[PDB]
Curated annotation (Swiss-Prot):
This is Small ribosomal subunit protein uS3. Binds the lower part of the 30S subunit head. Binds mRNA in the 70S ribosome, positioning it for translation. GO terms for molecular function: mRNA binding; rRNA binding; structural constituent of ribosome. SMART domains: KH. It comes from Escherichia coli O157:H7. Part of the 30S ribosomal subunit. Forms a tight complex with proteins S10 and S14. Some nascent polypeptide chains are able to cross-link to this protein in situ. Keywords: Ribonucleoprotein, Ribosomal protein, RNA-binding, rRNA-binding. GO terms for biological process: translation. Belongs to the universal ribosomal protein uS3 family. InterPro entries: KH_dom (IPR004087), KH_dom-like_a/b (IPR015946), KH_dom_type_2 (IPR004044), KH_sf_prok-type (IPR009019), Ribosomal_S3_C_sf (IPR036419), Ribosomal_uS3_bac-typ (IPR005704), Ribosomal_uS3_C (IPR001351), Ribosomal_uS3_CS (IPR018280).
Amino acid sequence: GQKVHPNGIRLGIVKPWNSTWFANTKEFADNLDSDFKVRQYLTKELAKASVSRIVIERPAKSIRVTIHTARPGIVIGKKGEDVEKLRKVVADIAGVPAQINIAEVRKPELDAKLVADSITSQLERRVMFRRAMKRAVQNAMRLGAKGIKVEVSGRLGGAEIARTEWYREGRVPLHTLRADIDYNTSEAHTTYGVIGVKVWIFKGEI
RNA sequence: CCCGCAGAAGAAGCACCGGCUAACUCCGUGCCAGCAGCCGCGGUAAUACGGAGGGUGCAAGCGUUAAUCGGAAUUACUGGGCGUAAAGCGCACGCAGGCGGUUUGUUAAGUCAGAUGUGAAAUCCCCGGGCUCAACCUGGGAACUGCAUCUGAUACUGGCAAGCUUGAGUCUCGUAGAGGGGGGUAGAAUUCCAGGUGUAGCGGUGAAAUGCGUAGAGAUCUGGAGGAAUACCGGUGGCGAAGGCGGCCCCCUGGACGAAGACUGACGCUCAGGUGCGAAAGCGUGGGGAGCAAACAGGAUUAGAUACCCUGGUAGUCCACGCCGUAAACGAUGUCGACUUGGAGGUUGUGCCCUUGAGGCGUGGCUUCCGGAGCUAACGCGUUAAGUCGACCGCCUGGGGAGUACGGCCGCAAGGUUAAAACUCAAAUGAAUUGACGGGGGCCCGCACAAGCGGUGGAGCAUGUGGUUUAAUUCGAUGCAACGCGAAGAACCUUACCUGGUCUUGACAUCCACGGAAGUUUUCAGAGAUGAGAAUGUGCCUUCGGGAACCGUGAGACAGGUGCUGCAUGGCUGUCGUCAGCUCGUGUUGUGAAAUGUUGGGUUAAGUCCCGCAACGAGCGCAACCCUUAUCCUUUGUUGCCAGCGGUCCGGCCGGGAACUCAAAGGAGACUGCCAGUGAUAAACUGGAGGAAGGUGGGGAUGACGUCAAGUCAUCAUGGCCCUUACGACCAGGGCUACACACGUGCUACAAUGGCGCAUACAAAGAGAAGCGACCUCGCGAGAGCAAGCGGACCUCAUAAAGUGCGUCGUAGUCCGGAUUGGAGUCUGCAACUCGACUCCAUGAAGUCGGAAUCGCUAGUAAUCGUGGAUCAGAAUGCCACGGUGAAUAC
RNA sequence: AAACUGGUA
RNA sequence: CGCGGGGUGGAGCAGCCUGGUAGCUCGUCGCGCUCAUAACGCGAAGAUCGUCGGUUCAAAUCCGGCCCCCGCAACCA
Ligand SMILES: [Mg+2]
Ligand SMILES: [Mg+2]
Ligand SMILES: [Mg+2]
Ligand SMILES: [Mg+2]
Ligand SMILES: [Mg+2]
Ligand SMILES: [Mg+2]
Ligand SMILES: [Mg+2]
Ligand SMILES: [Mg+2]
Ligand SMILES: [Mg+2]
Ligand SMILES: [Mg+2]
Ligand SMILES: [Mg+2]
Ligand SMILES: [Mg+2]
Ligand SMILES: [Mg+2]
Ligand SMILES: [Mg+2]
Ligand SMILES: [Mg+2]
Ligand SMILES: [Mg+2]
Ligand SMILES: [Mg+2]
Ligand SMILES: [Mg+2]
Ligand SMILES: [Mg+2]
Ligand SMILES: [Mg+2]
Ligand SMILES: [Mg+2]
Ligand SMILES: [Mg+2]
Ligand SMILES: [Mg+2]
Ligand SMILES: [Mg+2]
Ligand SMILES: [Mg+2]
Ligand SMILES: [Mg+2]
Ligand SMILES: [Mg+2]
Ligand SMILES: [Mg+2]
Ligand SMILES: [Mg+2]
Ligand SMILES: [Mg+2]
Ligand SMILES: [Mg+2]
Ligand SMILES: [Mg+2]
Ligand SMILES: [Mg+2]
Ligand SMILES: [Mg+2]
Ligand SMILES: [Mg+2]
Ligand SMILES: [Mg+2]
Ligand SMILES: [Mg+2]
Ligand SMILES: [Mg+2]
Ligand SMILES: [Mg+2]
Ligand SMILES: [Mg+2]
Ligand SMILES: [Mg+2]
Ligand SMILES: [Mg+2]
Ligand SMILES: [Mg+2]
Ligand SMILES: [Mg+2]
Ligand SMILES: [Mg+2]
Ligand SMILES: [Mg+2]
Ligand SMILES: [Mg+2]
Ligand SMILES: [Mg+2]
Ligand SMILES: [Mg+2]
Ligand SMILES: [Mg+2]
Ligand SMILES: [Mg+2]
Ligand SMILES: [Mg+2]
Ligand SMILES: [Mg+2]
């Protein structure tokens, strides 16, 4: 969209990076490739756990990953057995010793990545978008959001021509760098094509 | 009709499924075939066409066609309309006809009441009865709404008789008026004729020409002829039935209004047919004809102009007598009568009064505007109704055909009046709302214009595109918003495209079987891919039948597609446009679409802010938070720096120090903040002080709701379709670099503000490990050998050019200008021929400032001068980025 | 001063 | 042998008492203007003076022949 990405324009203001590792030009590209590969693998296996965001850092010659989820039971289960296999496989793919950590994020409905997935999941199960999206809105504000905005684009309802529909409630100042906006997207693969979902959540002014 | 035998045995189809209207999916087709009562579907994803499955409706029937009523209040008696949707005759007078104030009597026609007679049967309806129920048949009743006769009622209508005055009318006294017909006369001005002075133009247009004038125009003065109209007064003035009627005077004559008083006594309203009047144009006869002006002539404009414009000009316009009878003949509103809140004016009468006044209080006629209830689709009308009623008349029944054809009547003619049908469409139309647009208006902004500088379009060259050709010249992108664009690097690869040579579970993922360590070395053929051999090697885990890393062969599921659809899409992007706007809640207004807010008075770069207000609040957007830059302060002080001191090959280089530049972390500061003035006292504006920085200080990032079915299926993903012994995969070469032309964006020049030689100044920002590559040696050179240092304030790329100090050229195709071309070289790379970059020697085209046209820029801007970076083995005049010098003009 | 026009669905 | 004027580029044209670089209207090929077309503007190609002989720096303008067209005469086939 012609609007600059909120999660990219505030990286140096109120949005920490999802990767905090340092490296020279000799291995910067290799580190990027490893990070992308591990993220792509992990997000597929942990689809049920509803991972919000995955942060990766470089301890003293090793790989450390921290995944924030609202359903730590699936990834933890009994003892650390379900995380041991994930640790060993991520270490295998990264080529260096790995350490994975689980973080709990309560009130999942207030998370952008998560709210979207909900929507997309629903749509994929032939649910009326209009209402899928309206609940998302209400849910959130109930929880306390100072604002929320939802948008869905594509062949809504299997129509012959694509259409975009959005709902905005509360206050969502996109030009205020002081404010923090949790922005995220998500896609769906329905029999009629691909439907894009896009959610902004405004939590505070600073 | 009843009984007996046997046996589910002999018995279900038609229409429809997009909305109306009950009932949905797939496949085929691709604006074709076809469907269709109306709206309308079908131009590769059809619930509308064809088939299948499923479903809905009806059923021995179902559907289509034909016809009547209904719906249709769409001929409106019950029960419609005519200001603007169709529809008030141009106006008036009036016969027939319709209707008609009030008091009594009489009649009993209309009217109403009762009775009698009649209104065939069948049929319709109510209660019953019989066919096995029903249809069907049948008993009784009701109805048969009507008609006639007789007997009564007398409120209303009608008739007859007799009255009344409020409707209508006559008489007396006055008033205003472009009311009408005839005659007379006056002033101004235009034209023309005669004469006087005078002399080169006049006249007309946007600008011209035609035209008039030296045979004397135009201008000016004197005299005369003739035609037409009456300048102000003159007005939201007047008169007239309408059309219509303006100088002044006379004669004849119509209507209206006011004062009371008297008189008649319903004598009234309306009006088919009929009669009369009736703008302008037009016609007939006879006059007149100054101006104006159809037709016509010429000159202009134009692509054309038998038009708009200009110069002339006939009919006509004028008069008398006749005819024509039509107009947006409009108030788009028929006449008459009654009732219904007001306000402000004009014109014309009249009554009472302290009458002092150009004054107070009343009562009539006509007339203009605004508005209440009411009405109206709305606009609007509103005591002069389009409000509530009554009497009569005229007219309307979708649009076009058509106010047309035929017939009749009228006219000298032109034509007028009355007035159809066939056929064709699903609309035509009225009021109002939102938006857009206007060769409408107002206000405001932007390098929009203007004022300036420098350019492009001319020449050479670089690059992209179109076109053409080619084996291929891969595919995209196309006004602004494509054309140095995807592409931040086409000699192989890249690379899909062309020609050849090869493969078919494959180059790549995954399941299975068998064999085989991987890998390292060479050889035959061949352009290579490729086949075809010899070698070497035969190791980890190893449950001792094998796995994990990996290689070869084979079968089938598959893998694969830069193949199509950006008009199925996600994601991403361009533009209007960094313009200030775009919206939502409740509230209120309107039948409604919608309006309000959001408009108005100020102000701002801003829907920025203040005041007002039928609105009160909020959201996106603007500003502000962010980065950079300009001043100062705290900390820190090397690889950076050197003020005060010292030893100083007298170099910040070596003791040392940290003041300062500087480097990077944290703070201060600028906020219309302090004052003056202006301004509705508010917002705000102008100026001043202080201050490095005065008015969001300069610059960047930041791009609202939406438009362009804008771009991308090729970055990637993805619905549908297609290929899969080829549209997939491998290799050699070629091509994307062609070239009779055109266009876009740039570089280098046409020189003296310069070129060349010597000397010699002053910068910032970046990269560096298959990398940057000092110094030294060789070479006139691109470069080669040696090769330290440096993963970085250290070393290298890397001595910035413009600039300034001297000398030469002295205005030319030149000591400017460099393309082209020949010879000889340097360097990346398996590979420089198609097709790279750089260097040395030689030749030295075009070009001497560039048409129509067109582009950027308002301050460190433009202008011009250097340096770096990405892409990248080797490549820039392109892209990104840093600094030096440094303007002109904005009324 | 001049200043036309815009295939069909 | 028939009274006059003529013959410039694809077409129509200017140079006459003035024998001095071939120019101007419409056509062809370009460019500009416009969203696009027409209109309009700026440009380029295009030549023995119809064809020959005397005269002459010179060219229908000074002349003399040849060929073609037109006013009429041109009969009329
Ligand atoms: Mg239905
Ligand atoms: Mg189909
Ligand atoms: Mg009816
Ligand atoms: Mg009606
Ligand atoms: Mg009338
Ligand atoms: Mg009458
Ligand atoms: Mg009566
Ligand atoms: Mg009677
Ligand atoms: Mg019975
Ligand atoms: Mg019976
Ligand atoms: Mg009967
Ligand atoms: Mg009576
Ligand atoms: Mg009288
Ligand atoms: Mg009549
Ligand atoms: Mg007349
Ligand atoms: Mg006449
Ligand atoms: Mg006459
Ligand atoms: Mg005229
Ligand atoms: Mg008429
Ligand atoms: Mg009139
Ligand atoms: Mg009128
Ligand atoms: Mg009328
Ligand atoms: Mg009114
Ligand atoms: Mg007629
Ligand atoms: Mg007739
Ligand atoms: Mg500016
Ligand atoms: Mg200018
Ligand atoms: Mg050029
Ligand atoms: Mg394609
Ligand atoms: Mg192309
Ligand atoms: Mg194309
Ligand atoms: Mg290639
Ligand atoms: Mg598109
Ligand atoms: Mg309402
Ligand atoms: Mg608005
Ligand atoms: Mg509004
Ligand atoms: Mg305002
Ligand atoms: Mg605001
Ligand atoms: Mg010293
Ligand atoms: Mg100041
Ligand atoms: Mg901003
Ligand atoms: Mg942007
Ligand atoms: Mg398109
Ligand atoms: Mg396209
Ligand atoms: Mg090849
Ligand atoms: Mg190319
Ligand atoms: Mg030189
Ligand atoms: Mg480099
Ligand atoms: Mg560095
Ligand atoms: Mg040379
Ligand atoms: Mg020169
Ligand atoms: Mg390179
Ligand atoms: Mg036309």
